[PDB]
Design an enzyme around this catalytic site. Structure first.
Site, PDB file in Angstrom:
ATOM      1  N   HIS A 178      -7.643   9.276  -2.605  1.00 34.91           N
ATOM      2  CA  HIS A 178      -7.047   9.136  -1.255  1.00 34.91           C
ATOM      3  C   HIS A 178      -8.017   9.661  -0.143  1.00 34.91           C
ATOM      4  O   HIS A 178      -8.176   9.050   0.979  1.00 34.91           O
ATOM      5  CB  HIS A 178      -5.692   9.934  -1.030  1.00 34.91           C
ATOM      6  CG  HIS A 178      -4.770   9.270  -0.091  1.00 34.91           C
ATOM      7  ND1 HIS A 178      -3.597   9.505  -0.219  1.00 34.91           N
ATOM      8  CD2 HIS A 178      -5.060   9.096   1.303  1.00 34.91           C
ATOM      9  CE1 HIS A 178      -2.804   8.912   0.748  1.00 34.91           C
ATOM     10  NE2 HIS A 178      -3.764   8.767   1.728  1.00 34.91           N
TER      11      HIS A 178
ATOM     12  N   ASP B 269       0.665  -1.247  -0.143  1.00 34.11           N
ATOM     13  CA  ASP B 269      -0.033   0.013   0.136  1.00 34.11           C
ATOM     14  C   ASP B 269       1.029   1.266   0.061  1.00 34.11           C
ATOM     15  O   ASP B 269       1.588   1.492   1.012  1.00 34.11           O
ATOM     16  CB  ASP B 269      -1.084   0.155   1.191  1.00 34.11           C
ATOM     17  CG  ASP B 269      -1.904   1.304   1.123  1.00 34.11           C
ATOM     18  OD1 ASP B 269      -2.719   1.176   0.309  1.00 34.11           O
ATOM     19  OD2 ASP B 269      -1.446   2.172   1.793  1.00 34.11           O
TER      20      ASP B 269
ATOM     21  N   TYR C  94       3.186   9.999   0.517  1.00 34.17           N
ATOM     22  CA  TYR C  94       4.045   9.424   1.362  1.00 34.17           C
ATOM     23  C   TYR C  94       5.535   9.752   1.207  1.00 34.17           C
ATOM     24  O   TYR C  94       6.441   9.472   2.236  1.00 34.17           O
ATOM     25  CB  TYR C  94       4.021   7.892   1.496  1.00 34.17           C
ATOM     26  CG  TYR C  94       2.487   7.462   2.017  1.00 34.17           C
ATOM     27  CD1 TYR C  94       1.568   8.368   2.523  1.00 34.17           C
ATOM     28  CD2 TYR C  94       2.179   5.827   1.848  1.00 34.17           C
ATOM     29  CE1 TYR C  94       0.418   7.899   2.819  1.00 34.17           C
ATOM     30  CE2 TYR C  94       0.965   5.581   2.293  1.00 34.17           C
ATOM     31  CZ  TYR C  94       0.086   6.306   2.777  1.00 34.17           C
ATOM     32  OH  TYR C  94      -1.282   5.913   2.986  1.00 34.17           O
TER      33      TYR C  94
ATOM     34  N   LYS D  39      -2.341   5.985  -4.232  1.00 35.14           N
ATOM     35  CA  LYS D  39      -3.605   6.639  -4.278  1.00 35.14           C
ATOM     36  C   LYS D  39      -3.336   8.186  -4.933  1.00 35.14           C
ATOM     37  O   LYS D  39      -2.225   8.816  -4.761  1.00 35.14           O
ATOM     38  CB  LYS D  39      -3.848   6.980  -2.532  1.00 35.14           C
ATOM     39  CG  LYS D  39      -3.829   5.753  -1.954  1.00 35.14           C
ATOM     40  CD  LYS D  39      -4.135   5.720  -0.455  1.00 35.14           C
ATOM     41  CE  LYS D  39      -3.935   4.441   0.199  1.00 35.14           C
ATOM     42  NZ  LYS D  39      -2.302   4.659   0.776  1.00 35.14           N
TER      43      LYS D  39
HETATM   44  N1  LIG Z   1      -5.869   5.968   3.140  1.00 31.19           N
HETATM   45  C1  LIG Z   1      -5.568   6.599   4.267  1.00 31.19           C
HETATM   46  O1  LIG Z   1      -6.008   7.757   4.298  1.00 31.19           O
HETATM   47  C2  LIG Z   1      -4.513   5.995   5.122  1.00 31.19           C
HETATM   48  C3  LIG Z   1      -4.297   6.577   6.503  1.00 31.19           C
HETATM   49  C4  LIG Z   1      -3.551   5.754   7.346  1.00 31.19           C
HETATM   50  C5  LIG Z   1      -2.873   4.771   6.930  1.00 31.19           C
HETATM   51  N2  LIG Z   1      -2.787   4.191   5.658  1.00 31.19           N
HETATM   52  C6  LIG Z   1      -2.089   3.002   5.290  1.00 31.19           C
HETATM   53  O2  LIG Z   1      -2.261   2.275   6.258  1.00 31.19           O
HETATM   54  C7  LIG Z   1      -0.869   1.722   6.718  1.00 31.19           C
HETATM   55  C8  LIG Z   1      -0.855   1.290   8.269  1.00 31.19           C
HETATM   56  O3  LIG Z   1      -1.361   2.280   9.094  1.00 31.19           O
HETATM   57  P1  LIG Z   1      -0.341   3.285   9.916  1.00 31.19           P
HETATM   58  O4  LIG Z   1       0.890   3.430   9.162  1.00 31.19           O
HETATM   59  O5  LIG Z   1      -1.240   4.554  10.148  1.00 31.19           O
HETATM   60  O6  LIG Z   1      -0.381   2.430  11.365  1.00 31.19           O
HETATM   61  P2  LIG Z   1      -0.180   0.947  11.575  1.00 31.19           P
HETATM   62  O7  LIG Z   1       0.018  -0.195  10.924  1.00 31.19           O
HETATM   63  O8  LIG Z   1      -1.449   0.801  12.576  1.00 31.19           O
HETATM   64  O9  LIG Z   1       0.990   1.018  12.991  1.00 31.19           O
HETATM   65  C9  LIG Z   1       2.340   1.205  12.423  1.00 31.19           C
HETATM   66  C10 LIG Z   1       3.262   1.338  13.527  1.00 31.19           C
HETATM   67  O10 LIG Z   1       3.301   0.149  14.412  1.00 31.19           O
HETATM   68  C11 LIG Z   1       4.662  -0.074  14.566  1.00 31.19           C
HETATM   69  N3  LIG Z   1       4.552  -1.952  14.535  1.00 31.19           N
HETATM   70  C12 LIG Z   1       4.425  -2.412  13.493  1.00 31.19           C
HETATM   71  N4  LIG Z   1       4.459  -3.711  13.626  1.00 31.19           N
HETATM   72  C13 LIG Z   1       4.584  -3.968  15.037  1.00 31.19           C
HETATM   73  C14 LIG Z   1       4.741  -5.059  15.767  1.00 31.19           C
HETATM   74  N5  LIG Z   1       4.752  -6.207  15.562  1.00 31.19           N
HETATM   75  N6  LIG Z   1       5.141  -4.601  17.220  1.00 31.19           N
HETATM   76  C15 LIG Z   1       5.045  -3.500  17.627  1.00 31.19           C
HETATM   77  N7  LIG Z   1       4.850  -2.304  16.881  1.00 31.19           N
HETATM   78  C16 LIG Z   1       4.799  -2.667  15.497  1.00 31.19           C
HETATM   79  C17 LIG Z   1       5.408   0.287  13.390  1.00 31.19           C
HETATM   80  O11 LIG Z   1       6.787   0.650  13.774  1.00 31.19           O
HETATM   81  P3  LIG Z   1       7.988   0.338  12.733  1.00 31.19           P
HETATM   82  O12 LIG Z   1       7.648   0.598  11.645  1.00 31.19           O
HETATM   83  O13 LIG Z   1       8.955   1.316  13.368  1.00 31.19           O
HETATM   84  O14 LIG Z   1       8.512  -1.030  12.998  1.00 31.19           O
HETATM   85  C18 LIG Z   1       4.842   1.800  13.390  1.00 31.19           C
HETATM   86  O15 LIG Z   1       5.054   2.868  14.187  1.00 31.19           O
HETATM   87  C19 LIG Z   1      -0.090   3.049   6.396  1.00 31.19           C
HETATM   88  O16 LIG Z   1       1.210   2.917   6.615  1.00 31.19           O
HETATM   89  C20 LIG Z   1      -0.782   3.324   5.007  1.00 31.19           C
HETATM   90  O17 LIG Z   1       0.017   2.421   3.951  1.00 31.19           O
HETATM   91  C21 LIG Z   1      -3.883   5.115   4.863  1.00 31.19           C
HETATM   92  O1  LIG Z   2      -1.719   7.245   5.091  1.00 29.33           O
HETATM   93  C1  LIG Z   2      -2.223   8.224   5.324  1.00 29.33           C
HETATM   94  C2  LIG Z   2      -1.814   9.084   6.895  1.00 29.33           C
HETATM   95  C3  LIG Z   2      -2.287  10.640   6.275  1.00 29.33           C
HETATM   96  C4  LIG Z   2      -3.022  10.258   4.866  1.00 29.33           C
HETATM   97  O2  LIG Z   2      -3.657  11.292   4.192  1.00 29.33           O
HETATM   98  N1  LIG Z   2      -2.706   8.889   4.538  1.00 29.33           N
HETATM   99  C5  LIG Z   2      -3.465  11.309   7.034  1.00 29.33           C
HETATM  100  O3  LIG Z   2      -4.487  10.309   7.392  1.00 29.33           O
HETATM  101  N2  LIG Z   2      -3.380  12.521   7.438  1.00 29.33           N
HETATM  102  C6  LIG Z   2      -4.475  13.149   8.034  1.00 29.33           C
HETATM  103  C7  LIG Z   2      -5.566  13.696   6.998  1.00 29.33           C
HETATM  104  C8  LIG Z   2      -5.287  14.122   5.859  1.00 29.33           C
HETATM  105  C9  LIG Z   2      -6.174  14.558   4.880  1.00 29.33           C
HETATM  106  C10 LIG Z   2      -7.594  14.764   5.334  1.00 29.33           C
HETATM  107 BR1  LIG Z   2      -8.678  15.640   4.115  1.00 29.33          BR
HETATM  108  C11 LIG Z   2      -7.733  14.349   6.530  1.00 29.33           C
HETATM  109  C12 LIG Z   2      -6.710  13.914   7.458  1.00 29.33           C
HETATM  110  F1  LIG Z   2      -7.234  13.265   8.784  1.00 29.33           F
HETATM  111  C13 LIG Z   2      -2.242  13.409   7.144  1.00 29.33           C
HETATM  112  O4  LIG Z   2      -2.440  14.560   7.522  1.00 29.33           O
HETATM  113  C14 LIG Z   2      -1.091  12.733   6.635  1.00 29.33           C
HETATM  114  C15 LIG Z   2      -0.132  13.493   6.244  1.00 29.33           C
HETATM  115  C16 LIG Z   2       1.188  13.023   5.615  1.00 29.33           C
HETATM  116  C17 LIG Z   2       0.899  11.774   5.197  1.00 29.33           C
HETATM  117  F2  LIG Z   2       2.232  11.355   4.596  1.00 29.33           F
HETATM  118  C18 LIG Z   2      -0.034  11.122   5.352  1.00 29.33           C
HETATM  119  C19 LIG Z   2      -1.175  11.420   5.868  1.00 29.33           C
END
Ligand SMILES: NC(=O)c1ccc[n+]([C@@H]2O[C@H](COP(=O)([O-])OP(=O)(O)OC[C@H]3O[C@@H](n4cnc5c(N)ncnc54)[C@H](OP(=O)(O)O)[C@@H]3O)[C@@H](O)[C@H]2O)c1
Ligand SMILES: O=C1C[C@@]2(C(=O)N1)C(=O)N(Cc1ccc(Br)cc1F)C(=O)c1ccc(F)cc12
Length: 316
Positions: free
Chosen positions: A111, A44, A49, A78
């Site tokens: 996104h 993803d 990013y 995205k």
């Molecule tokens: N569509 C959107 O708007 C959106 C928003 C948020 C997230 N996303 C996607 O979803 C992905 C996952 O969400 P996220 O990055 O917010 O957070 P997450 O996956 O909930 O948590 C990541 C954190 O957990 C730690 N971690 C990972 N595996 C672990 C384990 N086995 N034990 C302990 N700690 C562990 C990582 O540390 P280390 O990396 O230092 O190991 C990192 O600090 C994102 O990276 C992104 O690709 C998308």
């Molecule tokens: O994976 C990710 C995390 C995320 C992201 O966008 N995708 C993120 O949720 N937000 C919060 C956010 C962004 C835009 C709007 Br609209 C609402 C919102 F809560 C951020 O500010 C943000 C800032 C820089 C990033 F590289 C990623 C994010």
């Protein structure tokens, strides 16, 4: 547990993927290499990013090493908010493709439903800290996403952070060409998303759960915020299964017929997080985990809350 879920375009999406938000460029190439080595086939990504080039390096190296073939990978990216204008969408997709060194994406998502003023800044703010919107709307952005499928740049399109009324707007478009294949939303025991998941699944849209570990590394975290990975109740469920808390948090959405995308750059954790196909959470475990819901959202942004399309005012 079957490892892939069928999308509306006939393609199969791996239910476990590697997240890459906050994977620094200097570390993410190794993370993706290790992930591929230990079995991840779904990555993803996103332009916002700031690491797609380094993700692409890793993918390229593993293709050249003959570890995987392109058809076995499922690469998601995205469209960022500053590119919602119909005339900017293709270029944004092609920039992502060029950075990732790919000739197609498996899935490309809007996104956020909010368009932001175009320009170099990802978060263009006015002098008072409010995000500056663009004069774009969900339906016209969707039509530009559809063109990407028709041109072969992406195999499937979807959405992220859309509430059910925003999903409905797309579904109800008369001249809709492609239904969204996926809605990627925050989901974990503190934000269980029962109503939006039921909605999306009833509409034949696959849900991907982001921040399944509670995004402890998020830049706006406050020390008093809840912490999933340190929740002693979840720890106790993990200990009963001789698994880690993270493994329980990854298996949880899998048993709800969701896709899940935990992020790590730590090789040992990348490997640990994939070892979730060899145990099952019980009915009681699932009920207990669902009972921790607090409607507590980690991904929210105050500066964006007045945008006309900000998704989190609606109940779901
Ligand atoms: N569509 C959107 O708007 C959106 C928003 C948020 C997230 N996303 C996607 O979803 C992905 C996952 O969400 P996220 O990055 O917010 O957070 P997450 O996956 O909930 O948590 C990541 C954190 O957990 C730690 N971690 C990972 N595996 C672990 C384990 N086995 N034990 C302990 N700690 C562990 C990582 O540390 P280390 O990396 O230092 O190991 C990192 O600090 C994102 O990276 C992104 O690709 C998308
Ligand atoms: O994976 C990710 C995390 C995320 C992201 O966008 N995708 C993120 O949720 N937000 C919060 C956010 C962004 C835009 C709007 Br609209 C609402 C919102 F809560 C951020 O500010 C943000 C800032 C820089 C990033 F590289 C990623 C994010």
């Amino acid at each position: 547990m079957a490892s892939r879920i069928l999308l509306n375009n006939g393609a199969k999406m791996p239910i476990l993927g590697l997240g890459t938000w906050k994977s620094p460029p200097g570390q993410v190439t190794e993370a993706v290499k290790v992930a591929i080595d230990v079995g991840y086939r779904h990555i993803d990504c996103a332009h916002v990013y700031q690491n797609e080039n380094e993700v692409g390096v890793a993918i390229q190296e593993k293709l050249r090493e003959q570890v995987v073939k392109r058809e076995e990978l499922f690469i998601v990216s995205k469209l960022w908010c500053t590119y919602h204008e119909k005339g900017l969408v293709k270029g944004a997709c092609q920039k992502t493709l060029s950075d990732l060194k790919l000739d197609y994406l498996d899935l490309y998502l809007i996104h956020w439903p909010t368009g932001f003023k175009p320009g170099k800044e990802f978060f263009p703010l006015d002098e008072s800290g409010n995000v500056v919107p663009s004069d774009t709307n969900i339906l016209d952005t969707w039509a530009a996403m559809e063109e990407l499928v028709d041109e072969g740049l992406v195999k499937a399109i979807g959405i992220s952070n859309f509430n059910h009324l925003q999903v409905e707007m797309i579904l109800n478009k008369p001249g809709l060409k492609y239904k969204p294949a996926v809605n990627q939303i925050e989901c974990h025991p503190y934000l269980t998303q029962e109503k939006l998941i039921q909605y999306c699944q009833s509409k034949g849209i696959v849900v991907t759960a982001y921040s399944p570990l509670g995004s402890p590394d998020r830049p706006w975290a406050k020390p008093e915020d809840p912490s999933l990975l340190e929740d002693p109740r979840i720890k106790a469920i993990a200990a009963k299964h001789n698994k880690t808390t993270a493994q329980v948090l990854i298996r949880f959405p899998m048993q709800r017929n969701l896709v899940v995308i935990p992020k790590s750059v730590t090789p040992e954790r990348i490997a640990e997080n994939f070892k979730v196909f060899d145990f099952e959470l019980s009915s009681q475990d699932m009920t207990t985990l669902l009972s921790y819901n607090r409607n507590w959202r980690v991904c929210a942004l105050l500066s964006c809350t007045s945008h006309k399309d900000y998704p989190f005012h609606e109940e779901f």
